[PDB]
Amino acid sequence: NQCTVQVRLELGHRAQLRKKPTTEGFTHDWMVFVRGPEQCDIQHFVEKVVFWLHDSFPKPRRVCKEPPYKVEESGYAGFIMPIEVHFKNKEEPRKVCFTYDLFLNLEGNPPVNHLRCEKLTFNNPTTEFRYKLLRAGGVMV
Numbered sequence: 001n002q003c004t005v006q007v008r009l010e011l012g013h014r015a016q017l018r019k020k021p022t023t024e025g026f027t028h029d030w031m032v033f034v035r036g037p038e039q040c041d042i043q044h045f046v047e048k049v050v051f052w053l054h055d056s057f058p059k060p061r062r063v064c065k066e067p068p069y070k071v072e073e074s075g076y077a078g079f080i081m082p083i084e085v086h087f088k089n090k091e092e093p094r095k096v097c098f099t100y101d102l103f104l105n106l107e108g109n110p111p112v113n114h115l116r117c118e119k120l121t122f123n124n125p126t127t128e129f130r131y132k133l134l135r136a137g138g139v140m141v
């Protein structure tokens, strides 16, 4: 049964100036996401993604149960965004948290377009979960 499976997640964000600062004077539009690499379907092993926005947002616990795993909002400032990626796994681990640095372009700088690549290593996953990771394009090591 000895077996290690690796899968890849990409977290990222885009930010630029709003032309029309909003009804609460929002200077930026931004978008944060979680995705797989090209030709991988992370929906096979990802139950859901939860984006924990700033406490100042309405309903700041944003849940994507299916792709795209993304939040699009307007704001005035960057903040640290907890992101939880829940797995379709019956044993441990059930999820992984990331602390995402959602930063905006200030002082009329070009738009932000950032990607953070994360490798997840699953040691001795169950038969069922191993199947999901490999279906998603996971690789045995």
Ligand SMILES: CC(C)(C)c1ccc(C(=O)Nc2ccc(CCC(=O)O)cc2)cc1
Pocket (backbone or CB within 6 Å): 026, 054, 056, 057, 058, 074, 075, 076, 077, 078, 079
């Ligand atoms: C500077 C600090 C405290 C980290 C921070 C950082 C960021 C923010 C921010 O942009 N909040 C916000 C911005 C837009 C909205 C949208 C409200 C709607 O849909 O009507 C709600 C809240 C607030 C505070």
